[PDB]
Ligand binder design. Structure first.
Ligand SMILES: CCCCCCCC/C=C\CCCCCCCC(=O)OC[C@H](COP(=O)(O)OCC[N+](C)(C)C)OC(=O)CCCCCCC/C=C\CCCCCCCC
Ligand SMILES: CCCCCCCC/C=C\CCCCCCCC(=O)OC[C@H](COP(=O)(O)OCC[N+](C)(C)C)OC(=O)CCCCCCC/C=C\CCCCCCCC
Ligand SMILES: CCCCCCCC/C=C\CCCCCCCC(=O)OC[C@H](COP(=O)(O)OCC[N+](C)(C)C)OC(=O)CCCCCCC/C=C\CCCCCCCC
Ligand SMILES: CCCCCCCC/C=C\CCCCCCCC(=O)OC[C@H](COP(=O)(O)OCC[N+](C)(C)C)OC(=O)CCCCCCC/C=C\CCCCCCCC
Ligand SMILES: CCCCCCCC/C=C\CCCCCCCC(=O)OC[C@H](COP(=O)(O)OCC[N+](C)(C)C)OC(=O)CCCCCCC/C=C\CCCCCCCC
Ligand SMILES: CCCCCCCC/C=C\CCCCCCCC(=O)OC[C@H](COP(=O)(O)OCC[N+](C)(C)C)OC(=O)CCCCCCC/C=C\CCCCCCCC
Ligand SMILES: CCCCCCCC/C=C\CCCCCCCC(=O)OC[C@H](COP(=O)(O)OCC[N+](C)(C)C)OC(=O)CCCCCCC/C=C\CCCCCCCC
Ligand SMILES: CCCCCCCC/C=C\CCCCCCCC(=O)OC[C@H](COP(=O)(O)OCC[N+](C)(C)C)OC(=O)CCCCCCC/C=C\CCCCCCCC
Ligand SMILES: CCCCCCCC/C=C\CCCCCCCC(=O)OC[C@H](COP(=O)(O)OCC[N+](C)(C)C)OC(=O)CCCCCCC/C=C\CCCCCCCC
Ligand SMILES: CCCCCCCC/C=C\CCCCCCCC(=O)OC[C@H](COP(=O)(O)OC[C@H](N)C(=O)O)OC(=O)CCCCCCC/C=C\CCCCCCCC
Ligand SMILES: CCCCCCCC/C=C\CCCCCCCC(=O)OC[C@H](COP(=O)(O)OC[C@H](N)C(=O)O)OC(=O)CCCCCCC/C=C\CCCCCCCC
Lengths: 198, 198
């Protein structure tokens, strides 16, 4: 209802906004023209000077790159030779170590793995006997616990049924007046709330 | 009474649960006793075949570990010498390489950085003229911007007050009646809320 009056004010607001979108926006364009006018001079001088300076800058930089690339080439070429000779030497040095140390490592592995064979074989076998006893214990206690679990489950089931029987009946018996009182409560509330929505 | 009678149903469950928990803990303990009994004899054998047999295990591994370390050290001495000798050659080669490389790098820098000095100087100096041109435009357009924006600001403020005073009165003429109505609705709603479950 009052929303119509308030929206009318919004209409005045829109009108007042449009008034600003007139002279102000036009002046904004004029201002932008001023900006672009100055920027035209700036851009012109900038572009022209950039192109004029970019030439000696890039060309002289290219010279730097030449001295650097050619210089580095004349550095990497001999360095590569030395590095390759040093690397091949390193490879030889390493290879002359990898052979004896390899033989050693292989023999070490033999003496270790073979030892492990004769150390883990009895170990696992011992574990088999131990795990057998462990399993047997788990069976002895397991079979017993199975009976215990079943027995206690029966007792707990009985304690559940002896509870469920009266609990369900009492819950239902109480749910009757409860649901009805709740119904009445809601019926009254809903009837009062509708008066607020009307 | 709901939370009272229902609680009794839980209490009777807890009490009878304890009646089962009693034997449960005893039987669990009994089974745990048998479990620990087996594990006791087990640990007696386990730790025995583990410790008494770990001696020959470690004694075996120690022999190998000793020879491994000894052979390793026996290799380390000449191998380190080889590496050091090779590294000495490589390092010495690098020493005689870093000398011309560094010297030429320094000389190249005389045609790099030094040449850039005579380039960056005029460029930055000219940049000062460019900055002046830009600054002048930014001063002209800036001063205009300030003027234009100020003029627009005043027009914004004048139209703003038209939407700050008459519009606020319109809002006040809405807030007041609306608050009265809302209060009536709230007064009844809050009152009806406590008229069902309290
Ligand atoms: C002497 C002279 C000195 C002074 C001059 C030097 C000044 C430097 C030069 C220029 C200034 C650039 C500023 C203007 C902005 C450009 C706006 C524009 O015109 O824009 C459109 C372009 C379109 O692309 P194009 O096809 O024309 O260009 C590809 C080129 N081709 C066709 C030509 C070969 O858009 C692009 O250039 C942008 C591409 C959009 C890609 C978005 C995906 C980004 C992904 C990940 C974000 C990574 C963040 C990483 C940073 C690290 C943070 C820790
Ligand atoms: C600064 C001076 C300059 C010196 C620069 C040297 C740069 C080296 C340059 C190029 C490397 C070659 C590229 C290798 C790319 C393979 C990637 C890959 O797919 O790779 C996994 C495979 C799997 O193996 P595979 O046998 O099943 O496959 C055999 C398969 N097929 C057919 C490829 C042989 O690997 C392979 O192929 C083999 C990879 C393993 C290589 C083992 C030999 C190592 C040599 C010496 C010992 C050095 C120890 C030094 C490090 C010490 C650290 C403390
Ligand atoms: C429906 C099934 C539910 C389970 C219950 C079984 C049935 C009921 C039977 C007996 C209950 C008797 C009363 C137990 C004593 C209660 C002590 C207590 O006040 O407790 C509540 C506290 C709560 O923390 P707070 O906020 O006070 O502390 C905050 C700490 N501040 C201040 C430092 C930051 O909790 C504590 O104290 C820590 C926990 C103490 C509760 C122990 C109950 C154990 C029951 C069954 C497990 C059976 C094990 C037997 C099997 C053997 C296996 C080898
Ligand atoms: C079926 C096996 C039952 C366990 C079930 C889980 C399976 C994982 C298996 C074995 C690990 C055993 C874990 C027992 C450790 C108890 C941890 C615990 O709950 O710690 C709290 C209690 C209560 O005191 P508090 O925190 O208030 O006081 C200290 C004060 N503070 C907190 C405030 C600053 O502290 C104490 O109990 C203090 C003494 C803790 C004893 C640590 C040494 C345990 C060593 C061996 C356990 C042997 C199991 C063998 C059974 C064979 C089964 C076949
Ligand atoms: C089949 C065989 C049959 C069964 C036979 C039964 C035999 C059982 C076998 C062995 C018995 C072991 C029990 C020993 C108990 C005491 C250990 C101990 O003496 O304990 C204390 C130490 C102290 O150390 P401290 O710094 O205090 O002393 C600084 C001291 N300084 C200078 C001297 C060295 O502590 C340490 O030795 C612990 C420090 C190292 C722990 C680092 C933890 C790192 C964190 C996470 C690991 C994550 C792995 C992720 C896996 C994912 C895979 C996907
Ligand atoms: C030609 C192109 C035109 C560009 C203009 C020319 C400018 C070049 C002029 C001079 C060289 C300086 C530039 C190098 C980078 C700066 C490193 C730096 O900031 O250094 C000083 C810092 C001092 O820290 P603080 O301990 O006093 O502060 C601790 C406490 N706080 C941080 C709170 C104050 O460190 C030290 O003095 C410790 C030593 C670290 C030295 C690093 C220099 C490395 C050299 C070159 C870069 C890598 C090139 C690699 C390419 C390879 C090609 C083969
Ligand atoms: C293929 C790839 C293509 C790339 C092409 C390369 C073209 C190069 C083009 C143009 C370069 C012209 C540079 C003009 C030379 C003068 C620079 C300048 O005016 O130099 C003096 C300033 C003043 O020192 P301050 O008192 O302000 O600092 C206090 C520092 N405190 C806290 C450590 C004590 O020093 C500074 O601005 C520097 C100290 C502040 C640290 C800034 C971050 C540096 C980062 C990495 C290391 C690089 C250093 C390179 C030199 C950069 C210069 C901008
Ligand atoms: C295009 C034509 C359409 C029509 C437009 C009509 C709009 C009306 C236009 C202009 C008239 C109002 C302009 C005057 C504004 C003030 C500017 C100013 O004097 O500023 C600086 C002050 C200084 O405070 P300080 O920080 O130094 O002191 C911190 C204090 N300590 C240190 C002391 C404790 O700051 C302040 O007064 C802080 C004020 C913050 C006010 C923010 C409100 C902005 C309004 C709208 C933005 C809408 C964005 C819409 C989303 C679009 C997404 C595409
Ligand atoms: C079937 C139906 C069932 C029937 C049952 C009945 C309904 C039961 C309903 C709710 C459960 C109880 C909770 C409500 C109790 C009121 C809490 C409250 O309100 O206590 C007031 C405090 C105010 O501050 P203070 O006096 O404690 O501090 C003093 C600071 N000194 C010292 C600087 C001066 O409140 C605060 O602290 C926090 C502010 C909370 C915001 C309140 C709204 C404010 C209005 C506009 C601001 C916009 C909020 C926008 C967020 C969206 C909300 C939908
Ligand atoms: C006092 C009692 C108090 C008890 C309070 C209990 C609490 C209840 C709380 C919540 C219940 C509401 C639960 C709402 C669950 C929302 C379920 C949902 O997402 O439904 C889908 C619709 C979708 O609408 P859209 O159909 O227009 O479809 C396009 C869609 N978005 C698309 O992209 O394709 O979205 C919509 O609901 C919008 C369409 C609405 C149609 C209007 C239908 C009109 C419905 C009712 C009008 C009755 C008034 C008649 C008198 C009018 C007078 C003129
Ligand atoms: C026609 C309809 C007209 C609508 C009219 C509405 C009018 C409503 C009337 C009154 C509103 C009341 C407005 C009250 C504003 C007061 C803001 C303020 O400074 O509050 C003070 C507090 C506390 O400061 P203290 O210095 O006391 O800090 C406590 C101290 N450090 C301590 O440890 O004890 O600061 C804080 O804790 C932070 C609070 C920040 C507030 C968030 C402010 C959020 C602001 C803006 C959000 C941007 C939203 C833009 C939405 C646009 C889309 C449409």
């Amino acid at each position: 209802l009052k929303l119509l009056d308030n929206w009318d004010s919004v209409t005045s607001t829109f009108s007042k906004l449009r008034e600003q979108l007139g002279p102000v926006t036009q002046e904004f364009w004029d201002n932008l023209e001023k900006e672009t006018e100055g920027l035209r001079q700036e851009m012109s001088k900038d572009l022209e000077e950039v192109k004029a300076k970019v030439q000696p800058y890039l060309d002289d930089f290219q010279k730097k790159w030449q001295e650097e690339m050619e210089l580095y080439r004349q550095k990497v070429e001999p360095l590569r030779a030395e590095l390759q000779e040093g690397a091949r030497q390193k490879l030889h040095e390493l290879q002359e170590k990898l052979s004896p140390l390899g033989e050693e490592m292989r023999d070490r592995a033999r003496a270790h793995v073979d030892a492990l064979r004769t150390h883990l074989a009895p170990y696992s076998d011992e574990l088999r006997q131990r795990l057998a006893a462990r399993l047997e214990a788990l069976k002895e206690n397991g079979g017993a616990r199975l009976a215990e679990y079943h027995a206690k489950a029966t007792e707990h089931l009985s304690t559940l049924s002896e509870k469920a029987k009266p609990a369900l009946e009492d819950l239902r018996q109480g749910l009757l007046p409860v649901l009805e009182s709740f119904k009445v409560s809601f019926l009254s509330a809903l009837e009062e709330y509708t008066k607020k929505l009307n």
